[PDB]
Amino acid sequence: IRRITTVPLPAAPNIPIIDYEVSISGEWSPWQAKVPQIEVETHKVAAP
Amino acid sequence: KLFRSLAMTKPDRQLIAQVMLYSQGFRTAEVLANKIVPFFKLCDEQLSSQSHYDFGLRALKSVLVSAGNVKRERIQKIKREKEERGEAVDEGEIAENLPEQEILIQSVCETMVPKLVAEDIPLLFSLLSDVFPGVQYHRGEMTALREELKKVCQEMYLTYGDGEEVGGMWVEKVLQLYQITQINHGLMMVGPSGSGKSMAWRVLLKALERLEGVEGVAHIIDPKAISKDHLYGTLDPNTREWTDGLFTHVLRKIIDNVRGELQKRQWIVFDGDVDPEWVENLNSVLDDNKLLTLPNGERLSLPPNVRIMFEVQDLKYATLATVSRCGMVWFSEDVLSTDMIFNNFLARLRSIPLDEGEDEAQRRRKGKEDEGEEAASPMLQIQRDAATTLQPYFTPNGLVTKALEHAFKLEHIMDLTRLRCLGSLFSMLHQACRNV
Amino acid sequence: VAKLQKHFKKMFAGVSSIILSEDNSVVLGISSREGEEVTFKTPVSITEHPKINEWLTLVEKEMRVTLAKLLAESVTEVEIFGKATSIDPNTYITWIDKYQAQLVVLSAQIAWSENVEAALSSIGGSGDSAPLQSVLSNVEVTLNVLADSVLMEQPPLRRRKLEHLITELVHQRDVTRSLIKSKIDNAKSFEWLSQMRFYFDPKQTDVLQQLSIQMANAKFNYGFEYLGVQDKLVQTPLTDRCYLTMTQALEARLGGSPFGPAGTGKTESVKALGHQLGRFVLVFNCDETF
Amino acid sequence: ATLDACSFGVTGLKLQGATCSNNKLSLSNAISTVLPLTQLRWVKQTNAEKKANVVTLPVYLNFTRADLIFTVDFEIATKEDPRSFYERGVAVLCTE
Amino acid sequence: VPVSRICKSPNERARLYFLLAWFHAIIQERLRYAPLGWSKKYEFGESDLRSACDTVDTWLDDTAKGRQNISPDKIPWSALKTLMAQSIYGGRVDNEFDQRLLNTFLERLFTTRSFDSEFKLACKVDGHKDIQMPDGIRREEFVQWVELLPDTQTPSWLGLPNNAERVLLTTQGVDMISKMLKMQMLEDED
Ligand SMILES: Nc1ncnc2c1ncn2[C@@H]1O[C@H](COP(=O)(O)OP(=O)(O)OP(=O)(O)O)[C@@H](O)[C@H]1O
Ligand SMILES: Nc1ncnc2c1ncn2[C@@H]1O[C@H](COP(=O)(O)OP(=O)(O)O)[C@@H](O)[C@H]1O
Ligand SMILES: [Mg+2]
């Protein structure tokens, strides 16, 4: 797709295109921003 | 020791064809027989082996009877055309100056081409040109039905073409479906998945609705989802009472005609894989008897308004007895091009509001064009603008087409079908405009 | 009696129903699947023969008697066309309409066989081929009349009768041409005996030994069982061989075994042979419906 | 030997029970004779009377003679009876 | 065959039976030399012979009508040729070329010239010699002629070429070695 497309794509070398989301604004944005880092209770460490 | 054995290895095709063609009144029968007989064996050898092909002698005799019928129809056509003018009429004189080869090739094409796969149709036409040189089959023109097809296709967001265009093959296939429904009282569509057989049948019913002023009703049944006992109804082994099955219930409903069902036209469509088990009772109906027999002992006579139809991805497990009784139209996968589906998508976007749901579904039929409703909602405007942005990429050689052709090369754990990918893409674009 | 109407297709060869008086007390005739009807010369009175077996046996007897008595009249009428230089199409079509398809084809075959027999008797070692030429001329005239009539628009039953007559007369023309080419000059030559022949003797009092069908050694009698408008078979040389061998086996009291690949006319040829002699054929399928 | 537009070359044919010289058959005691390059030529069917010196041999697939591919008409070199070719069981095999 | 059946009048009947017997021999022995003798091994058994005898009896009884003698010309040769070409022996034949071969045999044997003293049952036997019809008319003469036949039989008796034998043996020769190959290592397990 990057070869045949005219639409700009993400300009980060070692990231697949599938790892990026399209924001409501036109520009791309990585999915990694939308995944929080949480803390799990000791009660449910293996069955959350 | 008690039985005398005789080797009937090879019947005389040529002389049987000669005598039958002479029986139908053909002036030339020797040349026509000597041409048609090798042609059938040529088709049997050259064409790819498929279960539904039948180039045996029964098929040949049926084709020749059809050719005789077409010849007589042409005699009557010329006779009535001259009679409406001022003329002196003689049947023999009219029959003298006609091409018999044109009638025969027309009958052969009309009987075979609907069953032909898209891979085999050009081979068949090459063979036909070889055996019948300088003779071509021009398809009979159905102007009124084609105009109604155009109207319904524009109404249902479907492409229409006049042959050798974008969508010509699909129009031809629905016309063939009309022909087979006219001829036979039972027929099948045996294309692969995603070839437009169910859409073609729906369009045909809604077009004959306008053409003939007769109300089209559809009864779609999945036969394998339901058990055979519920399908055909089961007799209680004790405390004797009859429980009508679904198919028997539909047949009894149309036969009784409480709401005037005899006036209306009703088609029963078995939209599911054909198997020997659930079609045993249907064999009597599909045969020339046209009679459903049940363990209850009741004998339901199929009325002329009913037309038992079939949709199958394939007929791998269909008995030859079931295939023989029914007509058939093979909807090859290259009847629905990618451009047709993209046009359907972009046409659905421009006129179906994406949020209003089902309450406004009925209002779609209230307006024949929905004038003054261009701004039905802001959603319609947004998705129309989105379709305008998306049109350059949906072209016949655009981004989507090249991407799909490349993706078909890639191996997928599940079988990669065209319409699965296209429906996924359309749903994602729907959600894109919803996000906007 | 109405409930009995569905079971006749199992017992009789062609009788799909019985035509009855309005009070269902007298049987007036029989009818086929195609609607072709044979009206009994003498109706079977159910009231005088109340038992089912008795009046059914009388129905079978009257079917045979009336079929023979109508074949007699049909042969008597078609003898005129056999000896005529020109055939009026209207009279021929009227004759076709007046009589059943089975009796029509039988009358044509009987007339052709008797005409060829009289011809071969008349030539009698002199080498004069004029009578067989006359027979061929009459057959060709009838073929031209039928070819002209079949191009017209006809009712379905009359169209089937015309098709059967054409299919029979093409074979008759071929056989007569073969006889003329071979210069056959005696009725007892094998080239004529090997062809199936029909000998109708109206003077016989019994109605099951009137028409005699002969082929080489075999000398069958026509069982006058109503067959309806059956599908005739184009008498190819292979079907002629089948008929010859099968009648030879029947004359020797042996059984018949036409073996070959599928769809080569085996069972249909046997059915056609049985129907030509008027005997009830009953095909038994042998594919998971036995 | 140049092939005409309607002529196709074939090789590997074997002739059982005969020898072909000058495109004419003669009965031979050899078990089999290797046929050289054989030109199959398709011609418009002229209304030509079947000559008395013409024999219609088969062309079997192999020596078992279970499958028949087609038939070939050959002219007889001498005044030999064609029936002798039928009694002798003369034939043609695509392969030995 | 019972003696009374052949001894029945007219006197010519026995000669026909001899020809029929010879015919049934020639087709049968030829089955050894398949695929050369026939395209495939047909079941020309005794039932065909009995059917042929019944046909001959019926036709001669019809033609003679009890006459002690009938001329060789009056014998219905066409009926016999057609029936044993299509009904008796030809029914089993499916190949058209084997049917042609059967027609050739019947036309060569069943003819009026069979009753000539100079008739040759098999021409150019061994390329130089011929086999002549017996000149007798009774059953005993034909039986004695059969008993006095040479013991050394070649394929030329049946119309085949002599090297047909040379073919058959080598086929059996291969049939030997291949059979031994099926024995080489099921018995031997070292
Ligand atoms: N004439 C047409 N023009 C454009 N698109 C079409 C046309 N006919 C069908 N399509 C598209 O093809 C899709 C598949 O056609 P249809 O609904 O008839 O299914 P089908 O071929 O019977 O497949 P399945 O095996 O899934 O039932 C339709 O949903 C529509 O998207
Ligand atoms: N000589 C013939 N003349 C006319 N029709 C024939 C002839 N031979 C075969 N047919 C047709 O071909 C079909 C062959 O089917 P059938 O005879 O029922 O079973 P099979 O041939 O497999 O034994 C028949 O329906 C018959 O109409
Ligand atoms: Mg579908």
3-state secondary structure chain B: CCEEEEECCCCCHHHHHHHHHHHCCCCCCHHHHHHHHHHHHHHHHHCCCCCCCCCCHHHHHHHHHHHHHHHHHHHHHHHHHHHHCCCCCCHHHHHHCCCHHHHHHHHHHHHHHHHCCCCCHHHHHHHHHHHCCCCCCCCCCCHHHHHHHHHHHHHCCCCCCCCCCCCHHHHHHHHHHHHHHHHCCEEEECCCCCCCHHHHHHHHHHHHHHHHCCCEEEEEECCCCCCHHHHHCCECCCCCCECCCHHHHHHHHHHHCCCCCCCCEEEEEEECCCCCHHHHHHHHHHCCCCEEECCCCCEEECCCCEEEEEECCCCCCCCHHHHHHCEEECCCHHHCCHHHHHHHHHHHHHHCCCCCCCCCCCHHHHCCCCCCCCCCCHHHHHHHHHHHHHHHHHCCCCHHHHHHHHHHHCCCCCCCCHHHHHHHHHHHHHHHHHHC
* Gap between the Cα atoms of B101 and B26, Å rounded: 10
Whether B20 has its CB under 8 Å from any CB of chain C: the answer is: yes
Indicate the residue of E35, E104, E160 with minimum beta-carbon distance to D83: E104
* Gap between the Cα atoms of D50 and D59, Å rounded: 20
**CA angle at B154 for the pair B151 and B157, rounded to the nearest 5°:** 145
B242 CB-contact burial (10 Å; exposed 0-12 / middle 13-18 / buried 19+): middle
Residues on chain B touching A26 (C-beta within 8 angstroms): none
Distance from the first to the final alpha carbon of chain D: 24
- Among protein residues, the one with the nearest Cα to ligand 1's atom 30 is B341
Pairing mode, strands C197-200 and C211-215: antiparallel
CA distance C158 to chain E (A): 37
Cβ atoms of B201 and B189 within 8 Å: the answer is yes
Closest CA to B43 of B108, B102, B135: B108
- Among protein residues, the one with the nearest Cα to ligand 2's atom 21 is C263
Distances (CA, A) of B208 to B188, B213, B218, B327: 19, 7, 13, 19
**CA angle at C15 for the pair C12 and C21, rounded to the nearest 5°:** 125
C208 CB-contact burial (10 Å; exposed 0-12 / middle 13-18 / buried 19+): middle
Per the CB < 8 Å rule, is E83 touching C193? no
Count Cα neighbours of C66 within 13 Å in the Cβ-side half-sphere: 20
D18's CB contacts (< 8 A; 6+ apart) are: D25, D26, D27, D28, D33, D85, D88, D90
Pocket test for ligand 1, best of B202, B344, B394 (most atoms within 8 A of CB): B344
Residues on chain A touching B394 (C-beta within 8 angstroms): none
Residues on chain B touching E48 (C-beta within 8 angstroms): none
* Gap between the Cα atoms of C62 and C43, Å rounded: 8
Cβ atoms of E71 and E63 within 8 Å: the answer is no
- Among protein residues, the one with the nearest Cα to ligand 1's atom 16 is B196
* Gap between the Cα atoms of C118 and B274, Å rounded: 61
* Ligand with minimal distance to C235 CA: 2
Residues in chain B: 436
Cβ atoms of B397 and B338 within 8 Å: the answer is no
Tokens of B337: 């091009």
Chain B (129-188) residues lying within 8 Å, Cβ to Cβ, of chain A: none
Whether C241 has its CB under 8 Å from any CB of chain E: the answer is: yes
* Gap between the Cα atoms of B349 and B340, Å rounded: 14
**B430: number of Cβ within 10 Å:** 16
The ligand 1 atom at the shortest distance from the C-alpha of residue B203 is: 1
Per the CB < 8 Å rule, is B9 touching E92? no
Tokens of C161: 């009768």
CA distance B315 to chain A (A): 39
Nearest 10 degrees: CA dihedral of C242, C246, C247, C252?
Answer: 150
Q: Which H helix or E strand runs over C220? A: strand C218-221
Whether the upstream peptide bond of residue E10 has omega within 30° of 0, thus cis, is yes
E69's CB contacts (< 8 A; 6+ apart) are: E10, E11, E12
**B235: number of Cβ within 10 Å:** 13
Count Cα neighbours of C170 within 13 Å in the Cβ-side half-sphere: 26
Q: Resolution, rounded to a tenth of an Å?
A: 11.0
Q: How far is CA E33 from the centre of its chain?
A: 14
CA distance E126 to chain D (A): 12
> What residue of B is the nearest CA neighbor of A22?
B432
Closest CA to B308 of B280, B268, B273, B275: B268
Looking at beta carbons, which pairs linking A21-30 to residues 24 or more positions away fall under 8 Å?
Answer: A24/B435, A24/B436
Tokens of C5: 């109407």
Task: State whether residue A47 is helix, strand or coil.
Answer: coil
Experimental technique, in short, is cryo-EM
Q: How far is CA B383 from the centre of its chain?
A: 35
Closest CA to C114 of C161, C66, C68, C172: C172
Tell me which amino acid residue A2 is: R
Whether A1 has its CB under 8 Å from any CB of chain B: the answer is: yes
Distance from the first to the final alpha carbon of chain A: 39
Cβ atoms of B21 and B10 within 8 Å: the answer is no
Chain E (77-106) residues lying within 8 Å, Cβ to Cβ, of chain C: 78-79, 82-83, 86-87, 91, 94
* Gap between the Cα atoms of B11 and B8, Å rounded: 7
**CA angle at B214 for the pair B209 and B218, rounded to the nearest 5°:** 70
DSSP string for residues in E18-80: HHHHHHHHHHHHHGGGTTTSSSS-----HHHHHHHHHHHHHHHHHHHTT-S---TTTS-HHHH
Per the CB < 8 Å rule, is B9 touching C255? no
Per the CB < 8 Å rule, is C193 touching E54? no
Whether E39 has its CB under 8 Å from any CB of chain D: the answer is: yes
> What residue of E is the nearest CA neighbor of B6?
E91
* Gap between the Cα atoms of E139 and B231, Å rounded: 77
CA of B336 to the centre of ligand 1 (A): 7
* Gap between the Cα atoms of B145 and B153, Å rounded: 12
The ligand 1 atom at the shortest distance from the C-alpha of residue B196 is: 18
B263's CB contacts (< 8 A; 6+ apart) are: B214, B215, B257
Distance from the first to the final alpha carbon of chain E: 58
Q: Tell me if C11 CB under 6 Å of ligand 2.
A: no
Pocket test for ligand 2, best of B9, B57, B320 (most atoms within 8 A of CB): B57
Pocket test for ligand 2, best of C240, C243, C268 (most atoms within 8 A of CB): C268
Whether D55 has its CB under 8 Å from any CB of chain E: the answer is: no
* Gap between the Cα atoms of A11 and A32, Å rounded: 16
Q: Which H helix or E strand runs over E153? A: none
Closest CA to B124 of B49, B240, B195, B46: B46
CA distance B40 to chain C (A): 14
* Gap between the Cα atoms of E28 and E52, Å rounded: 15
Distances (CA, A) of C258 to B7, B61, B144, C171, E8: 6, 22, 53, 22, 34
B186's CB contacts (< 8 A; 6+ apart) are: B285, B286, B307, B308, B309, B310, B325, B326, B327
> What residue of D is the nearest CA neighbor of E105?
D87
Closest CA to B8 of D69, C164, D71, C244: C244
Pairing mode, strands B186-189 and B306-311: parallel
* Gap between the Cα atoms of D31 and B88, Å rounded: 74
Cβ atoms of D27 and E162 within 8 Å: the answer is no
Whether E92 has its CB under 8 Å from any CB of chain B: the answer is: yes
Count Cα neighbours of B380 within 13 Å in the Cβ-side half-sphere: 13
**CA angle at E56 for the pair E51 and E58, rounded to the nearest 5°:** 95
Tokens of E128: 């130089």
Pairing mode, strands E129-132 and E120-125: antiparallel
Cβ atoms of B73 and B211 within 8 Å: the answer is no
Pocket test for ligand 1, best of B190, B202, B341 (most atoms within 8 A of CB): B341
Chains A and E touch (3+ CB pairs under 8 A): no
C48 CB-contact burial (10 Å; exposed 0-12 / middle 13-18 / buried 19+): exposed
Tell me which amino acid residue B385 is: D
Distances (CA, A) of B54 to B42, B99, B324: 13, 27, 9
Residues on chain E touching D60 (C-beta within 8 angstroms): 39
Closest CA to B434 of B354, B347, B351, B375: B354
CA distance C190 to chain E (A): 6
Per the CB < 8 Å rule, is D65 touching E160? no
Per the CB < 8 Å rule, is E92 touching B7? yes
Residues in chain A: 48
**CA angle at D79 for the pair D78 and D85, rounded to the nearest 5°:** 85
Whether the upstream peptide bond of residue E35 has omega within 30° of 0, thus cis, is yes
- Among protein residues, the one with the nearest Cα to ligand 1's atom 23 is B194
- Among protein residues, the one with the nearest Cα to ligand 1's atom 24 is B193
Mutation choice for B interface testing from C139, C238, C243 by most B CBs within 10 A: C238
C6-22 CB burial, b ≥16 within 10 A, e <16: eebeeebbbbbbbebee
Cβ atoms of B336 and B195 within 8 Å: the answer is yes
Tell me which amino acid residue D74 is: F
Task: State whether residue C244 is helix, strand or coil.
Answer: helix
Sheet containing strand C17-20, strands side by side: C17-20, C26-31, C37-45
Chains D and E touch (3+ CB pairs under 8 A): yes
Mutation choice for A interface testing from B390, B394, B399, B429 by most A CBs within 10 A: B399
Whether A42 has its CB under 8 Å from any CB of chain B: the answer is: no
* Gap between the Cα atoms of D74 and C180, Å rounded: 32
Cβ atoms of D93 and D62 within 8 Å: the answer is yes
Per the CB < 8 Å rule, is E91 touching B4? yes
Per the CB < 8 Å rule, is C260 touching B8? yes
Per the CB < 8 Å rule, is E87 touching C193? no
Could you give phi then psi for residue B343, rounded to 5 degrees?
-65, -40
Cβ atoms of B343 and B422 within 8 Å: the answer is no
Cβ atoms of B236 and B285 within 8 Å: the answer is no
Tokens of E10: 């007219």
Closest CA to B182 of B266, B307, B299: B307
